[PDB]
Curated annotation (Swiss-Prot), chains A, B:
Entry superkingdom: Eukaryota
Official protein name in the record: Antigen peptide transporter 1
Annotated binding of ATP, by residue: 51-59, 154-160, 214
Organism expressing this protein natively: Rattus norvegicus (Rat)
Keywords for this protein: Adaptive immunity, ATP-binding, Endoplasmic reticulum, Immunity, Magnesium, Membrane, Metal-binding, Nucleotide-binding, Peptide transport, Protein transport, Translocase, Transmembrane, Transmembrane helix, Transport
Subunit annotation: Heterodimer of TAP1 and TAP2 (TAP1-TAP2). A component of the peptide loading complex (PLC), interacts via TAPBP with MHCI heterodimer; this interaction mediates peptide-MHCI assembly. Interacts with PSMB5 and PSMB8.
Main location as per UniProt: endoplasmic reticulum
Length: 255, 255
């Protein structure tokens, strides 16, 4: 293992390549989850990852954060195996959002800013919270952003939780953003604003975004769509292209 | 409160009325969540409940199970205040599904059959699992339906968990079924199958269904739609009716 965790380049393009990737979970090694899995995530694109329940979408998200390593094949980040990047470095360059709980006992400000090397200003905190749809509800609390998450049993609403978790990932400005059904709890207005940010803002134009979703309307807007079935990409392309093909994606839109 | 918890009738139509309902959570009593809230849920209808983040949709679901009581106004079930029904009786007649975890250390069969008065046959267990999309993956395990949930750290996929939780609610055959964003984790095929069950099957035809969702395509199919804003129903009717109305729902659809 001499090259393991050795890389932390100052510049990172965020070009991701899965190359003939297979995977089974270490503690369940005799059930194949990903197999012959090959795709490229290009910076400047939002790539949507879609497919049936259990097809392997969240597993792909896990491998992209080096939470696990491929059992076969290669996961490359700018041409180098992901395992050769420093643990803390990958944390700074790759941010993933799912449906996880917030950090109880810490403030909303802390929750948004958690894990940063720098201390963002309140202007910066408020700016990102306005994008995710978290600013209005936080500003309605008597202690504002200094309000404690989980205070006196208040669990927040699902979409409110999601808006805070999104702001946390957004303010990090990662080279690779992974949204694992991170907007399914957001309302129409909030979902629309987050999408505008990713598709229109200058800062996201150079970054790599993976959008995992069962929502057709989000998939339809992506620059590229990967259809994952039984741990492999059986078809891919734009919405229009996949509709012409009349395969699994078309059948998903029809259903 | 001599009438509190006293009712347990054999015949339950499932007609639900909120009448001028207000609510604040007991530990946060000075933040109003629901206010001037009036609607009816009729048996034989799927009623969709839609609205922005934090509008009070899950709170309504909680009040429908008598997990909390209204601070003002009335929650009637077949004309009688909900507080007047026996705690266990309501458990048998009202089932709610959300994104909650499964029961770890119990089998899949146990998870589906949990809390039932009777012991369902395997034909009955597999039938419901087939409707929710759980049968195929469960049937792939070496001990099948007798496989332990959470075995050796396997937490399943999000959609797989949701399919199990759905099967548990469906097999109870409650008079009132509450789906709190219970199908957003399900793939297209599974979502469609569940909808066919609710809209087409004879058993669900006499039952009351509340479908809480941010997915417009699901709302559009509903027999009635409630648009919740700031804890109050500001408009309601069919999709076509609300589209002709030209208010908040139409704006959401066109957004
Ligand atoms: N246990 C609680 N204690 C105090 N306040 C709560 C609690 N649960 C929810 N709330 C608050 O009540 C309001 C309504 O929340 P609810 O979860 O009902 O909204 P919702 O319409 O389901 O939201 P979303 O669409 O984001 O899921 C929110 O402002 C929320 O923070
Ligand atoms: N920690 C784990 N250990 C063992 N197996 C797992 C683990 N997590 C997921 N799996 C299995 O791997 C397969 C892929 O799961 P994954 O969560 O990647 O699918 P998904 O495409 O995101 O599913 P969904 O659309 O249902 O959310 C499933 O069969 C699942 O049960
Ligand atoms: Mg998943
Ligand atoms: Mg909710």
């Amino acid at each position: 293992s001499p090259l393991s965790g050795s890389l932390a380049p100052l510049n990172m393009k965020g070009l991701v390549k899965f190359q003939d990737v297979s995977f089974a979970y270490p503690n369940h090694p005799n059930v194949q989850v990903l197999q012959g899995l090959t795709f490229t995530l290009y910076p400047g694109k939002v790539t949507a990852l879609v497919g049936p329940n259990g097809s392997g979408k969240s597993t792909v998200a896990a491998l992209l954060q080096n939470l696990y390593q491929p059992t076969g094949g290669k996961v490359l980040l700018d041409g180098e195996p992901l395992v050769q990047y420093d643990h803390h470095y990958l944390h700074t360059q790759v941010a993933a959002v799912g449906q996880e709980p917030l950090l109880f006992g810490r403030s909303f400000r802390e929750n948004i800013a958690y894990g940063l090397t720098r201390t963002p200003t309140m202007e910066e905190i408020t700016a990102v919270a306005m994008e995710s749809g978290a600013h209005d509800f936080i500003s309605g609390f008597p202690q504002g952003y200094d309000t404690e998450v989980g205070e006196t049993g208040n669990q927040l609403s699902g979409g409110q939780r999601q808006a805070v978790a999104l702001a946390r990932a957004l303010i990090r400005k990662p080279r690779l953003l992974i949204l694992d059904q991170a907007t399914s709890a957001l309302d129409a207005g909030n979902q629309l604003r987050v999408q505008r940010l990713l598709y229109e803002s200058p800062e996201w134009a150079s970054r790599t975004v993976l959008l995992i979703t069962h929502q057709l309307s989000l998939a339809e807007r992506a620059h590229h769509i990967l259809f994952l079935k039984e741990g492999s990409v059986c078809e891919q392309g734009t919405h229009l292209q996949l509709m012409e093909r009349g395969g699994c994606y078309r059948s998903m839109v029809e259903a």
